[PDB]
Amino acid sequence: NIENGVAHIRSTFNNTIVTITDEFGNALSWSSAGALGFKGSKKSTPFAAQMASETASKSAMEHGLKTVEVTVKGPGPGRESAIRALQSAGLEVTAIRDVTPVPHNGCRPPKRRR
Amino acid sequence: MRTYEVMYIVRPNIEEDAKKALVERFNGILATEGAEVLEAKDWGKRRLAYEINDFKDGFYNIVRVKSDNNKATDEFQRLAKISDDIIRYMVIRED
Amino acid sequence: GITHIDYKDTELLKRFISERGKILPRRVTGTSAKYQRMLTTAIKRSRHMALLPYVK
Amino acid sequence: AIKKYKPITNGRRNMTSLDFAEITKTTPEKSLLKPLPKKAGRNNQGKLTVRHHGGGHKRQYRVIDFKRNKDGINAKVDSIQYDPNRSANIALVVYADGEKRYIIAPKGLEVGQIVESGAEADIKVGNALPLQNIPVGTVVHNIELKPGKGGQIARSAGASAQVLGKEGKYVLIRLRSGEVRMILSTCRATIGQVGNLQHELVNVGKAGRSRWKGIRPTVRGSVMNPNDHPHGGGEGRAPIGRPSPMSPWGKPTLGKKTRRGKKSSDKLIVRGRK
RNA sequence: AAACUUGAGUGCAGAAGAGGAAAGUGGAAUUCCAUGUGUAGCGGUGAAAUGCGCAGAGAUAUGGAGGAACACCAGUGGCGAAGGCGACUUUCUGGUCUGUAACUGACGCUGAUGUGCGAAAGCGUGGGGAUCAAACAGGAUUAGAUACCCUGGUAGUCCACGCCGUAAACGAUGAGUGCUAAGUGUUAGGGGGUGCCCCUUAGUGCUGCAGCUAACGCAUUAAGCACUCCGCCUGGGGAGU
């Protein structure tokens, strides 16, 4: 799955994960908070993701495509520190899906009415 | 032994008839099983230095209430949080 | 569910304190009477890791 | 609650009755009663189709409003009476205009309570409105199946349903038999749960008390003759002696399903019973 | 009986205790699957892993999920009886303490009301059984080990509602003494007045010397000697029968 990189960035206040995968579910690289090593509540801050995905978007040598399709989800102190992380990694940031896990429980049954 | 200075503020829009029944409940939990107070007062039209909940006015009735059973400044604190009757209170433990 | 300060806040522990950082007076604020309880909570909590000088 | 009896007789050794404490009035409306002929397991031909159905105490049907199509007007509860043709209790509701019928009394209902109906109604116990106006995660009862046809689901004492979703052509709702299924959300449904939750803890105790409800004795099919039941003939106490137990009309009655296939509402059922 | 005192009574001014967070919008998971560290990934062995179709089959950065919901403020805390709290978070509930005495004045037995309070299996387990986990499939030796290890795998661990009771409750270690070395910490709060001289000491961690104890060992909180009922060894036994 070369010339493509559908990455999914997770924004939280504890252990922020921002890995870059390929079009198909397959982890091409493994480097983030788990491969970091900071128990001082700094693995989910603005410098966390940037440094966590630094080697992840540098030791790829397979994907690293111009597109990243960053899918940020969930509230976090440095939520805008992961979208720019990929932009400073060497690629760029364009596709952004702003949809966190906060359903409003709103569905509709039969139509054919008002 | 354990004196308490409660300076609770009432709502800016309350009828005197209901105000008398409002202070009666507050005084009932303050003068319960022995009042042992100093002197009661009744402040009226006045302006507060600080603003809280962007109101317009607020009736005053701060009275010293010395206690030994420690049950006069009990419900009062809960009254200015659960229900919407009191806004700014006080919790002084100084003798 | 009430407007409360978190432990992350590091600049919200020395707002109305003296140079040395001792107990603050009751005539130096200007908010509500329920804000004084949070003022004393920022002192005791910041007096364990020596982040707030005891006597500067 | 539940009241026990002192063992003064062998018939009242384990007999347990219900403590009617929720009941307020002991007299029904004279303008809301209809006679009951009591067919007692008999069809139009006169032949017995269903067994175990004898006489019992006389009863009087009480017109119940399962439609609740009186929106705009309010109604205050009058009293909670006892119904013999139902397992739950009924509450006499008084409106304005004229209609004043009975309604299935909810679990948490008291005398002197206002009840509304229609899209523009508050979410309080007793109120009835459309399924689309009910927030997801609410416990409702007396649900309809066809727009303006009357409730047919969750009508038993203690019965209750829970709103889960609205798929895309129906509304998803979990039943009391742990079975999720889609249902049109254009129908109405009462909010809350049915009362009389201690109606399954009652212990008859006497065999003559079952005759009062109208239940005749049930004879076992393993003690009959060969030309009366599959397990008829047999010297002494013998076993089934067949691949699987059969019914009186020679039909498997253990595991074999009977739900007819290719049903109109066979695409509305999401999960099955557990 | 006439009488005043602080050192203790509520604790007189103290600070962390919020005597106590069960928690909806919540977002992070072993399972199905939208669809991924999505197919060797994980539950996974002193040597010894079991688990995931045979007429149609898991791996979790996620996502459409969390629990007995919650990592950090849970501290040699105040501890008032064996008994120190949360995804910040609210309740003052008798109440216990060191330097201090506002108030009357008057000084005992870990105490006859030992409420029979009392980890623990069992008790009012409402609910309970899920990564799982006894047993169980098992895997393993060498001249010797269904053990234990781990594993798909029932129970086994869970909430208000008479109630629930042995302990390493006493580290096999309960009991009113002081005084001939200094302190007296704890969580973090306090003066003489600048924290330099002081701060006796207790709720708690206790620091050895006169004298005892056959010795071991008790001493600014001895078992020397001036203050309570108690009290244990009796045939080793038998006998905890």
Side-chain angles (χ1 to χ4, degrees), chain A residues 1 3-60 64 66-114, chain B residues 2-95, chain C residues 1-8 10-56, chain D:
Chain A
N1 201 297
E3 268 285 290
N4 200 272
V6 191
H8 132 239
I9 81 112
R10 128 116 263 78
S11 315
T12 17
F13 168 52
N14 241 45
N15 321 327
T16 270
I17 317 307
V18 166
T19 82
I20 61 170
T21 33
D22 317 82
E23 220 154 43
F24 175 53
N26 153 33
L28 65 102
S29 159
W30 243 155
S31 277
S32 188
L36 226 51
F38 300 127
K39 107 117 250 97
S41 96
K42 49 178 94 72
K43 253 172 34 153
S44 29
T45 60
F47 150 67
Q50 179 67 60
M51 161 51 222
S53 351
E54 197 4 53
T55 169
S57 207
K58 168 219 54 167
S59 74
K66 191 249 143 198
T67 193
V68 298
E69 294 108 0
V70 52
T71 55
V72 56
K73 179 155 187 114
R79 231 209 65 244
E80 289 313 302
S81 70
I83 280 161
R84 97 229 180 317
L86 274 290
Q87 184 92 1
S88 330
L91 343 186
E92 214 186 80
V93 76
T94 59
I96 296 131
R97 183 169 112 137
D98 251 7
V99 60
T100 170
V102 293
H104 297 349
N105 299 315
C107 33
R108 33 66 283 298
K111 298 156 291 243
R112 324 285 162 117
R113 60 130 100 219
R114 199 198 201 165
Chain B
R2 287 173 237 306
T3 95
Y4 265 93
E5 292 67 30
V6 304
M7 307 226 319
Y8 43 108
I9 305 317
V10 213
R11 243 82 188 155
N13 229 317
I14 279 176
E15 325 105 296
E16 212 180 340
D17 204 343
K19 241 297 273 198
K20 275 150 47 199
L22 248 188
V23 298
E24 260 171 354
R25 296 190 218 114
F26 289 3
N27 200 273
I29 307 152
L30 271 173
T32 200
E33 308 309 294
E36 295 168 349
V37 303
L38 287 293
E39 82 186 332
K41 359 255 195 339
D42 241 9
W43 319 349
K45 59 194 279 293
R46 242 137 97 183
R47 324 195 257 221
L48 247 173
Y50 47 60
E51 41 82 19
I52 288 298
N53 270 322
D54 322 296
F55 284 127
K56 184 70 32 207
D57 216 33
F59 323 118
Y60 301 144
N61 67 315
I62 304 162
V63 179
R64 274 311 97 78
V65 294
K66 173 125 164 138
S67 147
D68 171 292
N69 180 213
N70 323 299
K71 293 277 187 198
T73 200
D74 280 19
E75 295 359 305
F76 150 78
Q77 146 149 88
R78 259 271 137 317
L79 293 163
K81 203 224 98 188
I82 313 315
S83 165
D84 264 24
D85 33 349
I86 324 166
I87 319 88
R88 336 133 189 259
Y89 30 116
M90 214 358 187
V91 267
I92 328 190
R93 340 283 201 88
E94 314 276 340
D95 262 58
Chain C
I2 325 169
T3 76
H4 225 163
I5 49 188
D6 231 358
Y7 333 147
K8 298 352 149 211
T10 312
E11 53 83 6
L12 267 207
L13 307 164
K14 292 108 180 131
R15 19 208 211 232
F16 306 97
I17 330 290
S18 67
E19 36 146 314
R20 283 175 165 175
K22 211 61 172 302
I23 304 65
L24 55 77
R26 270 92 51 59
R27 253 29 209 188
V28 302
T29 82
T31 330
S32 215
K34 159 277 177 186
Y35 173 43
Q36 284 113 49
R37 271 16 274 160
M38 336 270 87
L39 279 206
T40 211
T41 295
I43 301 290
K44 301 319 142 188
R45 183 182 274 152
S46 63
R47 282 248 186 106
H48 176 35
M49 341 286 179
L51 60 135
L52 164 48
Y54 231 87
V55 59
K56 239 174 323 186
Chain D
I2 283 286
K3 60 168 306 187
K4 253 152 327 291
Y5 288 107
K6 314 319 276 324
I8 65 165
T9 328
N10 262 349
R12 290 183 157 209
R13 204 159 260 303
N14 305 295
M15 154 153 339
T16 281
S17 163
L18 198 41
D19 160 26
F20 319 92
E22 325 176 21
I23 297 318
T24 290
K25 197 139 155 336
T26 83
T27 301
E29 196 38 21
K30 187 192 166 156
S31 84
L32 285 176
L33 293 186
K34 324 294 299 345
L36 228 28
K38 179 187 321 295
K39 343 293 341 261
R42 253 82 169 183
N43 66 19
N44 61 22
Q45 278 170 341
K47 294 162 45 132
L48 167 148
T49 296
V50 178
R51 336 174 288 178
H52 321 147
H53 268 93
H57 211 292
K58 184 147 115 186
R59 294 172 175 174
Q60 278 221 277
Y61 185 61
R62 293 158 171 72
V63 176
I64 296 281
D65 179 352
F66 289 120
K67 294 208 171 130
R68 313 271 313 279
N69 41 31
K70 276 266 282 208
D71 326 320
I73 317 91
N74 298 349
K76 63 177 350 304
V77 178
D78 185 312
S79 53
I80 324 299
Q81 286 150 40
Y82 154 108
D83 184 0
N85 327 95
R86 218 150 329 262
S87 84
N89 292 326
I90 71 199
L92 177 39
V93 142
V94 159
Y95 283 80
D97 302 332
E99 217 238 274
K100 282 141 205 145
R101 233 140 46 135
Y102 289 102
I103 52 127
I104 281 170
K107 186 200 151 3
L109 192 93
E110 319 139 348
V111 38
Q113 195 170 321
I114 302 323
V115 301
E116 281 176 357
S117 35
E120 64 311 334
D122 216 337
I123 296 75
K124 315 309 320 305
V125 169
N127 299 71
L129 60 174
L131 274 164
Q132 46 174 343
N133 306 15
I134 286 143
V136 157
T138 308
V139 157
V140 317
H141 76 270
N142 188 326
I143 318 168
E144 286 187 311
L145 258 209
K146 294 204 174 121
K149 196 238 175 146
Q152 285 163 110
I153 321 303
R155 276 168 29 157
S156 192
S160 87
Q162 205 187 3
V163 171
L164 273 198
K166 329 208 206 209
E167 192 98 297
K169 225 315 131 162
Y170 291 104
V171 123
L172 267 52
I173 275 177
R174 216 217 306 299
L175 297 196
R176 203 57 175 44
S177 45
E179 174 252 33
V180 179
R181 79 163 264 157
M182 301 178 200
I183 269 170
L184 291 182
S185 145
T186 300
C187 355
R188 336 157 85 54
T190 316
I191 311 279
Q193 195 200 356
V194 196
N196 222 15
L197 282 50
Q198 328 216 261
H199 165 278
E200 62 171 40
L201 266 41
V202 168
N203 183 333
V204 200
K206 281 179 9 173
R209 196 170 164 198
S210 268
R211 310 288 315 257
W212 295 345
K213 301 188 202 280
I215 301 165
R216 292 186 48 86
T218 297
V219 180
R220 266 140 53 239
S222 70
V223 296
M224 278 161 136
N225 268 144
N227 61 280
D228 276 322
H229 199 283
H231 345 147
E235 88 178 3
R237 290 217 202 86
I240 307 308
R242 297 188 69 124
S244 147
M246 320 262 303
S247 91
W249 308 265
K251 286 259 198 44
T253 176
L254 219 58
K256 186 129 211 349
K257 301 187 129 38
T258 48
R259 190 196 206 299
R260 281 204 315 79
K262 269 182 290 137
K263 269 258 266 199
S264 98
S265 70
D266 209 331
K267 64 197 6 204
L268 287 213
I269 304 190
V270 164
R271 229 165 317 297
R273 321 176 332 244
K274 283 343 307 180

